[PDB]
């Protein structure tokens, strides 16, 4: 009789389900949710208990959402969170409700949060769109303006993904850049992350990130936005270049270091010779 009287509590089920859902690979989120739903077998508990796991995943991934009546999409991020499941669209100067399970926007309302940073944001947003279009085939960006501890900061989020489940792979790029303007200088904080999953007849997963730190001299809105984009361009180019170098490096160093293609002698092992030689070499090398 296998002891079935130690069943996992409702609080422990939510903690486990929330962990599996929030770490779901890009492009496999719904598949992870459906598997977790069957494992817990309690729809009310998972739906109410994991609501924060849906919000956390959608914001961490910069989930782009289409707003009815507008040409482009807006990124769902923590920087746009207005409370009550609503996010700010700083380009369209509205707030909207976002359904984290359906990923649908509704009830757009006028909202202006930029204040005295409107000119700073508009210069950065325009320069960034030109950058994203030149370097990302299907890239999206959203630029927020905030006052943080009395400091003027422009926050640029860039998202790009390629999901081809029919080809057995999914990949996502994320870049977040916070530019805090404290005249005569500005602090640059960047975080770059890439995740790729390829699972045709196997499983290989890449997770890589780099923190970037820089600084700029503050001028006018137009020159300051142009210098910020060039810093992003150089830092992301070096990051992608270094990943390409790591692929060549791993083949020659780390990958061969774990298992050599051949022994130091550059010969295949002669299994008949080893059986007799092992005895001969132990006494001859002593």
């Amino acid at each position: 009789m296998a002891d079935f009287d130690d069943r996992v509590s409702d609080e422990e089920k939510v903690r486990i389900a929330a962990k599996f859902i929030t770490h779901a690979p890009p492009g496999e989120f719904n598949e992870v949710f459906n598997d977790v739903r069957l494992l817990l077998n309690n729809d009310n508990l998972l739906r109410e208990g994991a609501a924060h796991a849906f919000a956390q995943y959608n914001m961490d991934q910069f989930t782009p959402v289409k707003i009815e009546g507008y040409e482009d999409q807006v990124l769902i991020t923590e920087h746009g969170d207005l409370g009550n499941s609503r996010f700010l669209d700083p380009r369209n100067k509205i707030s909207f409700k976002f359904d984290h399970l359906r990923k649908e926007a509704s009830d757009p309302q006028p909202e202006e949060a930029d204040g005295g940073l409107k000119s700073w944001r508009e210069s950065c947003d325009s320069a960034l769109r030109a950058y994203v279009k030149d370097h990302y085939s299907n890239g999206f960006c959203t630029v927020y303006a905030k006052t943080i501890d009395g400091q003027q900061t422009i926050i640029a989020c860039i998202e790009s993904h390629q999901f081809q489940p029919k080809n057995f792979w999914n990949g996502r790029w994320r870049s977040e850049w916070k530019f805090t303007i404290t005249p005569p200088t500005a602090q640059v904080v960047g975080v770059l992350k890439i995740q790729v999953h390829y699972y045709e007849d196997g499983n290989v997963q890449l997770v890589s990130h780099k923190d970037v730190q820089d600084s700029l001299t503050v001028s006018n809105e137009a020159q300051t936005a142009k210098e910020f984009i060039k810093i992003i361009e150089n830092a992301e180019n070096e990051y992608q270049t270094a990943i390409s170098e790591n692929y060549q490096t791993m083949s020659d160093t780390t990958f061969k270091a774990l298992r050599r293609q051949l022994p130091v002698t550059r010969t295949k092992i002669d299994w008949n010779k080893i059986l007799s030689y092992k005895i001969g070499k132990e006494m001859q090398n002593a």
């Binding site: 080809n167 293609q261 051949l262 550059r266 010969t267 295949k268």
Partner: protein, 188 residues
């Protein structure tokens, strides 16, 4: 590398060709009398007929088993001692890296080129190895043009004859202005 491997094996047989001029004779021996065995371990184990070759001066040398053991290097790079994939592995891997939709067409349309494929029975051995490495129930059709050696040049002549080629190349003046950049921009 096969010509160097043949010279090493002939020296073990007891025929020395130390001079750089004599190495050209070793290449001539390979080109004239060298076949790739369909089963390597079978012909390796079995005692081979001592096939005589006549040198430029008049002296006769017995080539024997070296005929088929030399060209095996292409499929077994460990013979020389190089940590690389076999020629048959390179072909199949190159197709498998391509997208699922094109893999079946790339296996269907295989084109042989280069001088080192001219070995007697090369196609028979390669076709057997591709089928073993390739996925199950895949059509493997390997086409060999009679003028393998001239394929690259003939293509160049065709491209050069086109009017589009006038836009494609980098002029002397364009090179002087931009520099090395001009070749990198316009080169495909």
């Amino acid at each position: 590398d096969v010509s160097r491997f043949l010279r090493l094996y002939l020296r073990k047989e007891g025929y020395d060709f130390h001079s750089s001029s004599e190495f050209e004779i070793v290449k001539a021996i390979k080109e004239r009398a060298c076949y790739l065995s369909i089963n390597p371990q079978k012909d390796e184990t079995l005692e081979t007929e001592k096939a005589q070759y006549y040198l430029p001066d008049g002296s006769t040398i017995e080539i024997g088993p070296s005929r088929f053991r030399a060209p095996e290097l292409l499929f077994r790079p460990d013979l020389i001692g190089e940590e690389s994939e076999g020629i048959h592995e390179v072909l199949v891997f190159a197709i498998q890296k391509s997208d699922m939709d094109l893999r079946r067409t790339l296996f269907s349309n295989i084109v042989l080129s280069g001088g080192s494929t001219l070995f007697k029975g090369f196609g028979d051995r390669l076709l057997s190895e591709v089928k073993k490495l390739a996925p199950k129930d895949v059509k493997i059709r390997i086409s060999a043009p009679q003028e393998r050696l001239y394929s690259t040049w003939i293509g160049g002549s065709i491209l050069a004859s086109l009017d589009t080629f006038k836009k494609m190349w980098v002029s002397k003046k364009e090179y002087e202005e931009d520099g090395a950049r001009s070749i990198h921009r316009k080169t495909f």
